Amino acid sequence: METIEGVVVVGGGPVGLLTALKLGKAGVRVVVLESEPRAVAYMPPTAAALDRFGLLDDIRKRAVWCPDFAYRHGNGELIAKMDWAVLAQDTDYPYMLLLAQNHVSNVIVEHLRKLPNVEIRWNHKVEEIDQDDDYVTMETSGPAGKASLRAKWVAATDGARSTVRGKIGLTFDGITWSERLVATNVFYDFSLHGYSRANFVHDPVDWAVVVQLDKTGLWRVCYGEDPDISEAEVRRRLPERFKRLLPGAPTPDQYRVDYLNPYRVHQRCAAEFRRGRVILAGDAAHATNPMGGLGLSGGVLDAEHLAEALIAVIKEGASTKVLDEYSVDRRKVFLEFTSPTATANFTWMKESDPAQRARDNAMFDHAGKDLKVMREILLDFEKLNGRR
């Protein structure tokens, strides 16, 4: 029985990798267990956190620089443009960065690879987990077969229920399923037709998120479709849907669909973010409305705080009260800011009452024209920091 006098991080998404990164940089011994939707937008407080991790330069080189985001009607007409530059006196990072999760993960891997105290186990999954007073014990399956592992502390970061999160007996509350969404990746020059790099389209039927994924010119278009039909019928309907979702009403030859996936997600929030020596972060702890949550995962600031707390315990002899302050603070951010904001944004996006829509359009229009009010709204993202 291999024993790790340090931390085991289960899940090699960005949140897991970041957690390992900051731990590893402080000398803590870390073993990451990676195994097999995606979050792609970084707001200013998140960019500030990435600078502290030392990752912002390498990320800025790959990311799509996004100075503004737009609200639009279903005919593509502009409702309001929010310009991050209005924050140039408030932050060193007055912009949004857009990048697909896999590219972010590859950057973070290159930095971990310079830390000999950090080891990554590819495609190792956690089949069983339990703890006692001293250690967390895990049963793992990898390409080598079954094996056993124990660690002082475990940080679980992965969303599936089959993983650690649904094996330590935590309550999950706020559980709501989504309607049927379709995520597509498209090669279409949206910007040639007046779109911004990130766009919220507000329409009772043809609402959508349109946001750029990487520097190849691939874009993500998320929209709603009838939940009763087969995946085959979804694909058959797309051409006709794109005549409205894409500006200029293109015909099939003007664009290329690289990926198409219907899906549904559960919102949820764990009752407590820690159970003994196991601590949750990111997608293992909570999930926000998928369609209103752009830039609101909280994953990066989760990871920063979690690693700061574990360093204090392991390297500095602090009591585990810091791990409890972590749980309370991040859970407050989700409950009182992130979740409600994502739910409000989605409610505005799909409103069907013509009188409420006009009230909503006037509000966005005004936020777009009065730069002081645009400023106030954009500054609200600083609540991702919580009270730390």
Short mmCIF file of C-alpha atoms in Angstrom, two decimals:
data_model
loop_
_atom_site.label_atom_id
_atom_site.label_comp_id
_atom_site.label_asym_id
_atom_site.label_seq_id
_atom_site.Cartn_x
_atom_site.Cartn_y
_atom_site.Cartn_z
CA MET A 1 0.00 0.00 0.00
CA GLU A 2 1.47 3.17 -1.41
CA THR A 3 0.97 6.02 1.01
CA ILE A 4 1.04 9.68 0.09
CA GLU A 5 2.06 12.16 2.75
CA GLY A 6 0.49 15.02 0.84
CA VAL A 7 -2.63 15.38 -1.29
CA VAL A 8 -4.34 13.29 -3.90
CA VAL A 9 -6.33 15.25 -6.46
CA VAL A 10 -9.02 13.27 -8.22
CA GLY A 11 -9.81 14.82 -11.56
CA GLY A 12 -7.57 16.50 -14.09
CA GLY A 13 -9.78 19.25 -15.33
CA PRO A 14 -8.42 22.77 -14.89
CA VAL A 15 -9.71 23.01 -11.35
CA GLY A 16 -7.87 19.86 -10.27
CA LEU A 17 -4.73 20.82 -12.14
CA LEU A 18 -4.68 24.29 -10.68
CA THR A 19 -5.07 22.94 -7.23
CA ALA A 20 -2.12 20.63 -7.75
CA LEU A 21 -0.18 23.46 -9.32
CA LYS A 22 -0.36 25.77 -6.28
CA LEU A 23 0.16 22.92 -3.80
CA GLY A 24 3.13 21.68 -5.79
CA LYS A 25 4.71 25.12 -5.99
CA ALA A 26 4.65 25.22 -2.18
CA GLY A 27 6.50 21.88 -1.86
CA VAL A 28 3.50 19.69 -1.05
CA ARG A 29 3.54 16.21 -2.51
CA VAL A 30 0.67 15.74 -4.97
CA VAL A 31 -0.67 12.90 -7.04
CA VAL A 32 -3.25 13.78 -9.61
CA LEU A 33 -5.68 11.09 -10.84
CA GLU A 34 -7.08 12.14 -14.24
CA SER A 35 -9.88 10.37 -16.11
CA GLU A 36 -11.82 11.12 -19.39
CA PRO A 37 -20.21 20.94 -21.47
CA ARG A 38 -16.72 22.63 -21.10
CA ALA A 39 -16.10 26.06 -19.41
CA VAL A 40 -14.32 28.60 -21.68
CA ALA A 41 -14.69 32.24 -20.47
CA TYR A 42 -12.45 33.96 -17.91
CA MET A 43 -13.67 37.19 -16.31
CA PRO A 44 -11.35 39.81 -14.77
CA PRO A 45 -11.18 38.39 -11.21
CA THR A 46 -10.46 35.00 -12.68
CA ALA A 47 -7.74 36.51 -14.89
CA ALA A 48 -6.29 38.12 -11.74
CA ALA A 49 -6.26 34.67 -10.03
CA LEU A 50 -4.49 33.13 -13.10
CA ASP A 51 -1.79 35.85 -12.84
CA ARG A 52 -1.19 34.75 -9.21
CA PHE A 53 -0.87 31.12 -10.47
CA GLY A 54 1.70 32.46 -13.02
CA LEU A 55 -0.40 31.12 -15.91
CA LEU A 56 -1.78 34.31 -17.38
CA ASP A 57 0.96 34.96 -19.95
CA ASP A 58 0.86 31.50 -21.46
CA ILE A 59 -2.95 31.61 -21.46
CA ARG A 60 -3.11 35.08 -23.00
CA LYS A 61 -1.02 33.81 -25.92
CA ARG A 62 -3.57 31.12 -26.76
CA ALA A 63 -6.83 32.78 -25.79
CA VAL A 64 -9.27 34.78 -27.75
CA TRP A 65 -9.11 38.34 -26.50
CA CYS A 66 -12.62 39.57 -25.93
CA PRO A 67 -12.99 43.31 -25.13
CA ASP A 68 -16.78 43.20 -25.11
CA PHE A 69 -19.85 40.95 -25.02
CA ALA A 70 -23.20 41.60 -26.63
CA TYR A 71 -26.90 41.09 -26.00
CA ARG A 72 -28.91 40.62 -29.22
CA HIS A 73 -32.37 39.87 -30.48
CA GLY A 74 -33.05 36.76 -32.45
CA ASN A 75 -32.69 38.66 -35.72
CA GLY A 76 -29.07 39.40 -34.58
CA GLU A 77 -29.73 43.11 -33.97
CA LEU A 78 -27.82 44.58 -31.13
CA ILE A 79 -29.56 45.31 -27.82
CA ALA A 80 -26.50 46.31 -25.81
CA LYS A 81 -22.74 45.93 -25.92
CA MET A 82 -20.91 45.74 -22.61
CA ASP A 83 -17.33 47.05 -22.84
CA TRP A 84 -14.84 45.73 -20.33
CA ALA A 85 -12.66 48.79 -20.92
CA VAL A 86 -14.99 50.79 -18.64
CA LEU A 87 -13.09 49.03 -15.86
CA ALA A 88 -9.67 50.22 -16.92
CA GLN A 89 -9.41 52.26 -13.69
CA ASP A 90 -10.64 49.37 -11.50
CA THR A 91 -8.55 46.39 -12.60
CA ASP A 92 -5.35 45.36 -14.27
CA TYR A 93 -7.45 42.89 -16.31
CA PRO A 94 -10.15 44.88 -18.15
CA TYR A 95 -11.12 42.17 -20.55
CA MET A 96 -12.54 38.69 -20.97
CA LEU A 97 -10.42 35.77 -22.19
CA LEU A 98 -12.07 32.91 -24.16
CA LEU A 99 -10.34 29.53 -24.51
CA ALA A 100 -11.53 25.89 -24.68
CA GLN A 101 -10.87 23.83 -21.52
CA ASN A 102 -8.48 21.34 -23.19
CA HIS A 103 -6.13 24.13 -24.26
CA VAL A 104 -6.21 25.56 -20.70
CA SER A 105 -5.51 22.10 -19.28
CA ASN A 106 -2.49 21.65 -21.64
CA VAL A 107 -0.99 24.96 -20.43
CA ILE A 108 -1.41 23.93 -16.86
CA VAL A 109 0.16 20.55 -17.55
CA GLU A 110 3.32 22.19 -19.00
CA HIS A 111 3.76 24.10 -15.72
CA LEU A 112 3.16 21.03 -13.55
CA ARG A 113 5.73 19.14 -15.53
CA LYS A 114 8.40 21.44 -14.06
CA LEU A 115 7.59 20.25 -10.54
CA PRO A 116 9.15 16.95 -9.62
CA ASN A 117 7.02 16.77 -6.39
CA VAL A 118 3.87 16.50 -8.58
CA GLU A 119 2.99 13.27 -10.44
CA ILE A 120 0.08 12.84 -12.88
CA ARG A 121 -1.55 9.43 -13.38
CA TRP A 122 -3.39 9.45 -16.74
CA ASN A 123 -6.73 7.59 -16.95
CA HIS A 124 -6.58 6.41 -13.32
CA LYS A 125 -10.07 6.30 -11.84
CA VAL A 126 -11.29 6.05 -8.28
CA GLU A 127 -13.44 2.92 -7.83
CA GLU A 128 -13.70 2.96 -4.01
CA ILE A 129 -13.02 5.47 -1.23
CA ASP A 130 -13.19 5.56 2.56
CA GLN A 131 -11.41 7.33 5.36
CA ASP A 132 -10.40 7.00 8.95
CA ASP A 133 -8.80 9.55 11.32
CA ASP A 134 -5.34 9.42 9.77
CA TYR A 135 -5.73 8.68 6.00
CA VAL A 136 -8.14 8.49 3.11
CA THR A 137 -7.86 5.04 1.43
CA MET A 138 -8.72 4.60 -2.27
CA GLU A 139 -9.15 1.65 -4.65
CA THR A 140 -7.95 2.74 -8.12
CA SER A 141 -8.20 1.30 -11.65
CA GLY A 142 -5.75 2.26 -14.37
CA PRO A 143 -4.13 0.81 -17.46
CA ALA A 144 -1.93 -1.19 -15.08
CA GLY A 145 -5.04 -2.75 -13.42
CA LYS A 146 -6.36 -2.36 -9.86
CA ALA A 147 -4.33 -0.80 -7.08
CA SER A 148 -4.59 0.74 -3.62
CA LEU A 149 -3.70 4.24 -2.47
CA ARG A 150 -3.85 6.31 0.77
CA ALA A 151 -3.38 10.01 1.40
CA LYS A 152 -3.53 12.59 4.14
CA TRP A 153 -5.98 14.70 2.12
CA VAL A 154 -8.09 14.27 -0.95
CA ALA A 155 -9.35 17.06 -3.20
CA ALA A 156 -12.10 15.80 -5.46
CA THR A 157 -12.80 17.98 -8.53
CA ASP A 158 -14.80 15.88 -10.99
CA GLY A 159 -18.55 16.11 -11.68
CA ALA A 160 -19.77 12.52 -12.35
CA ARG A 161 -21.81 10.95 -9.45
CA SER A 162 -19.88 7.64 -9.95
CA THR A 163 -16.77 9.55 -8.65
CA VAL A 164 -15.74 10.42 -4.99
CA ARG A 165 -18.48 13.13 -4.57
CA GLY A 166 -21.29 10.53 -4.46
CA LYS A 167 -19.26 8.01 -2.43
CA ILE A 168 -18.64 9.91 0.87
CA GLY A 169 -22.35 10.41 1.59
CA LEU A 170 -22.84 14.16 1.19
CA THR A 171 -26.23 15.64 0.59
CA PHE A 172 -26.69 17.45 -2.70
CA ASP A 173 -29.44 20.06 -2.73
CA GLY A 174 -30.75 22.59 -5.29
CA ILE A 175 -30.95 19.76 -7.82
CA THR A 176 -32.70 20.83 -11.03
CA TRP A 177 -32.49 19.26 -14.47
CA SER A 178 -32.13 21.38 -17.57
CA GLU A 179 -34.24 21.35 -20.69
CA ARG A 180 -32.68 19.87 -23.79
CA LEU A 181 -29.82 21.90 -25.13
CA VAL A 182 -27.71 21.39 -28.20
CA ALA A 183 -24.03 22.38 -28.11
CA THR A 184 -22.49 22.79 -31.53
CA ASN A 185 -18.99 23.76 -32.67
CA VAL A 186 -19.09 25.72 -35.92
CA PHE A 187 -16.65 27.21 -38.36
CA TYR A 188 -18.44 30.40 -39.33
CA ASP A 189 -16.99 33.85 -39.33
CA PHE A 190 -19.43 35.39 -36.90
CA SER A 191 -17.33 38.51 -36.44
CA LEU A 192 -17.45 39.29 -40.19
CA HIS A 193 -21.22 39.71 -39.70
CA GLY A 194 -21.05 42.04 -36.70
CA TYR A 195 -21.07 39.64 -33.74
CA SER A 196 -18.86 40.02 -30.78
CA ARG A 197 -16.69 37.23 -29.45
CA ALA A 198 -19.36 36.42 -26.85
CA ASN A 199 -23.09 36.96 -27.50
CA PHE A 200 -26.30 36.30 -25.62
CA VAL A 201 -29.27 36.01 -27.98
CA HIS A 202 -32.61 36.73 -26.33
CA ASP A 203 -35.66 35.24 -27.92
CA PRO A 204 -38.43 33.03 -26.59
CA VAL A 205 -37.66 30.21 -29.13
CA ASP A 206 -34.31 30.92 -30.81
CA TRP A 207 -32.28 32.02 -27.78
CA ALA A 208 -28.60 31.00 -27.85
CA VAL A 209 -25.09 31.48 -26.60
CA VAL A 210 -22.58 32.18 -29.27
CA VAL A 211 -19.06 32.38 -28.10
CA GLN A 212 -15.63 31.78 -29.74
CA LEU A 213 -13.73 28.62 -28.68
CA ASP A 214 -10.18 29.10 -30.04
CA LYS A 215 -7.91 30.87 -32.60
CA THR A 216 -8.81 28.46 -35.44
CA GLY A 217 -12.15 30.31 -35.83
CA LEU A 218 -14.25 27.59 -34.22
CA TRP A 219 -17.28 28.88 -32.33
CA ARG A 220 -19.67 27.42 -29.85
CA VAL A 221 -23.39 27.86 -30.49
CA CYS A 222 -25.69 26.57 -27.71
CA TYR A 223 -29.44 26.57 -28.27
CA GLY A 224 -32.65 24.79 -27.21
CA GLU A 225 -34.48 22.06 -29.13
CA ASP A 226 -37.71 20.01 -28.67
CA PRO A 227 -37.02 17.37 -25.99
CA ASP A 228 -39.17 14.57 -27.57
CA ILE A 229 -37.26 14.06 -30.85
CA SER A 230 -34.33 11.75 -31.72
CA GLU A 231 -30.75 12.90 -32.16
CA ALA A 232 -31.19 12.15 -35.87
CA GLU A 233 -34.06 14.65 -36.11
CA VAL A 234 -32.00 17.26 -34.18
CA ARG A 235 -29.28 17.07 -36.83
CA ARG A 236 -31.85 17.15 -39.61
CA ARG A 237 -33.35 20.36 -38.16
CA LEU A 238 -30.12 22.22 -37.66
CA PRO A 239 -29.81 23.71 -41.15
CA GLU A 240 -33.15 25.40 -40.72
CA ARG A 241 -32.32 26.48 -37.18
CA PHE A 242 -29.07 28.02 -38.40
CA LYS A 243 -30.89 30.19 -40.90
CA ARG A 244 -31.92 32.15 -37.78
CA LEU A 245 -29.12 31.49 -35.29
CA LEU A 246 -26.33 32.64 -37.60
CA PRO A 247 -26.17 36.21 -38.88
CA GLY A 248 -26.68 36.78 -42.59
CA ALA A 249 -29.04 33.72 -42.87
CA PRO A 250 -26.36 31.47 -44.37
CA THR A 251 -26.97 28.41 -46.50
CA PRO A 252 -25.26 25.18 -45.54
CA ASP A 253 -22.15 25.87 -47.70
CA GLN A 254 -21.35 29.01 -45.84
CA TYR A 255 -20.58 27.16 -42.57
CA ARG A 256 -19.16 23.93 -41.28
CA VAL A 257 -20.43 22.07 -38.26
CA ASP A 258 -17.52 20.29 -36.57
CA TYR A 259 -19.39 18.86 -33.54
CA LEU A 260 -22.98 18.42 -32.51
CA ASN A 261 -24.19 17.14 -29.11
CA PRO A 262 -27.61 17.30 -27.43
CA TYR A 263 -27.44 17.26 -23.68
CA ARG A 264 -29.03 18.05 -20.35
CA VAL A 265 -27.37 19.02 -17.09
CA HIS A 266 -28.32 19.00 -13.47
CA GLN A 267 -27.85 22.01 -11.34
CA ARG A 268 -26.84 21.15 -7.80
CA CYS A 269 -24.90 22.24 -4.77
CA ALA A 270 -23.31 20.06 -2.08
CA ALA A 271 -24.63 20.73 1.48
CA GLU A 272 -21.03 20.87 2.80
CA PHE A 273 -17.87 21.16 0.67
CA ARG A 274 -15.83 18.90 2.96
CA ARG A 275 -16.40 15.52 4.61
CA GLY A 276 -13.38 14.74 6.81
CA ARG A 277 -10.19 14.45 4.73
CA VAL A 278 -12.12 14.72 1.44
CA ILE A 279 -12.75 18.22 0.04
CA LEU A 280 -14.76 19.11 -3.05
CA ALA A 281 -14.18 21.87 -5.48
CA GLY A 282 -15.36 22.95 -8.88
CA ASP A 283 -17.84 20.64 -10.66
CA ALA A 284 -17.69 18.10 -7.80
CA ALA A 285 -19.16 20.74 -5.43
CA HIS A 286 -21.75 22.55 -7.60
CA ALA A 287 -23.17 23.24 -11.07
CA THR A 288 -24.86 26.44 -12.21
CA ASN A 289 -27.51 26.80 -14.89
CA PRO A 290 -25.54 25.86 -17.99
CA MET A 291 -27.01 28.60 -20.22
CA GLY A 292 -26.64 31.61 -17.90
CA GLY A 293 -23.38 30.51 -16.26
CA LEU A 294 -20.90 31.80 -18.77
CA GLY A 295 -17.80 32.85 -16.84
CA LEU A 296 -19.41 31.80 -13.57
CA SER A 297 -18.05 28.38 -12.75
CA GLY A 298 -16.00 29.79 -9.82
CA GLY A 299 -13.62 26.85 -10.43
CA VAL A 300 -10.45 28.87 -10.56
CA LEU A 301 -11.09 30.78 -7.35
CA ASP A 302 -12.33 27.59 -5.68
CA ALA A 303 -8.98 25.97 -6.54
CA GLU A 304 -6.97 28.93 -5.25
CA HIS A 305 -8.65 29.00 -1.89
CA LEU A 306 -8.64 25.20 -1.46
CA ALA A 307 -4.93 24.97 -2.14
CA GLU A 308 -4.23 27.96 0.13
CA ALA A 309 -6.13 26.19 2.96
CA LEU A 310 -4.39 22.81 2.45
CA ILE A 311 -1.00 24.45 2.43
CA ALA A 312 -1.78 26.05 5.76
CA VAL A 313 -2.70 22.75 7.33
CA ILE A 314 0.12 20.68 5.86
CA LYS A 315 3.04 23.06 5.80
CA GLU A 316 2.08 25.49 8.55
CA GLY A 317 0.37 23.24 11.18
CA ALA A 318 -2.85 25.31 11.07
CA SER A 319 -6.01 23.69 12.31
CA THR A 320 -8.59 22.40 9.97
CA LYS A 321 -10.81 25.40 10.73
CA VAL A 322 -9.31 26.91 7.54
CA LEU A 323 -10.80 24.01 5.55
CA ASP A 324 -14.16 24.82 7.01
CA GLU A 325 -13.79 28.54 6.16
CA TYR A 326 -13.07 27.36 2.60
CA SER A 327 -16.35 25.44 2.49
CA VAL A 328 -18.45 28.19 3.93
CA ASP A 329 -16.95 30.94 1.74
CA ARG A 330 -17.18 29.13 -1.61
CA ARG A 331 -20.58 27.80 -0.81
CA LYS A 332 -21.77 31.33 -0.07
CA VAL A 333 -20.41 32.56 -3.42
CA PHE A 334 -22.34 29.88 -5.25
CA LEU A 335 -25.59 30.28 -3.33
CA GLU A 336 -25.76 34.05 -3.06
CA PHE A 337 -24.18 35.13 -6.35
CA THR A 338 -23.29 32.54 -8.98
CA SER A 339 -26.37 30.37 -8.94
CA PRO A 340 -28.87 33.24 -8.74
CA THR A 341 -27.11 35.22 -11.40
CA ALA A 342 -27.00 32.36 -13.84
CA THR A 343 -30.72 31.67 -13.21
CA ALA A 344 -31.67 35.36 -13.76
CA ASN A 345 -29.58 35.59 -16.98
CA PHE A 346 -31.28 32.48 -18.39
CA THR A 347 -34.77 33.77 -17.38
CA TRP A 348 -34.14 37.03 -19.30
CA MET A 349 -32.75 35.11 -22.30
CA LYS A 350 -35.90 32.96 -22.80
CA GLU A 351 -38.67 35.37 -21.60
CA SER A 352 -41.88 34.93 -23.66
CA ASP A 353 -44.23 37.60 -22.26
CA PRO A 354 -44.08 40.53 -24.72
CA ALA A 355 -44.51 43.13 -21.97
CA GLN A 356 -41.77 41.68 -19.75
CA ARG A 357 -39.48 41.38 -22.79
CA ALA A 358 -39.91 45.12 -23.52
CA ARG A 359 -39.18 45.94 -19.87
CA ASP A 360 -36.05 43.69 -20.06
CA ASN A 361 -34.88 45.14 -23.42
CA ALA A 362 -35.13 48.75 -22.10
CA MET A 363 -33.05 47.74 -19.03
CA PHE A 364 -30.28 46.18 -21.16
CA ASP A 365 -30.44 48.96 -23.69
CA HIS A 366 -29.95 51.48 -20.86
CA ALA A 367 -27.08 49.49 -19.27
CA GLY A 368 -25.48 49.63 -22.71
CA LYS A 369 -25.70 53.43 -23.07
CA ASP A 370 -25.00 54.77 -19.60
CA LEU A 371 -21.35 53.89 -19.02
CA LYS A 372 -21.61 54.40 -15.26
CA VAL A 373 -24.30 51.75 -15.00
CA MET A 374 -22.45 49.41 -17.34
CA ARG A 375 -19.55 49.86 -14.97
CA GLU A 376 -21.61 48.83 -11.93
CA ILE A 377 -22.88 45.66 -13.53
CA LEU A 378 -19.43 44.61 -14.75
CA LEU A 379 -17.92 45.25 -11.33
CA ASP A 380 -20.35 42.70 -9.84
CA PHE A 381 -18.19 39.88 -11.15
CA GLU A 382 -15.78 40.75 -8.32
CA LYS A 383 -18.20 38.80 -6.07
CA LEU A 384 -16.60 35.65 -7.44
CA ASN A 385 -13.85 36.43 -4.90
CA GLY A 386 -16.20 36.07 -1.89
CA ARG A 387 -14.89 37.58 1.37
CA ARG A 388 -11.24 36.27 1.41
#
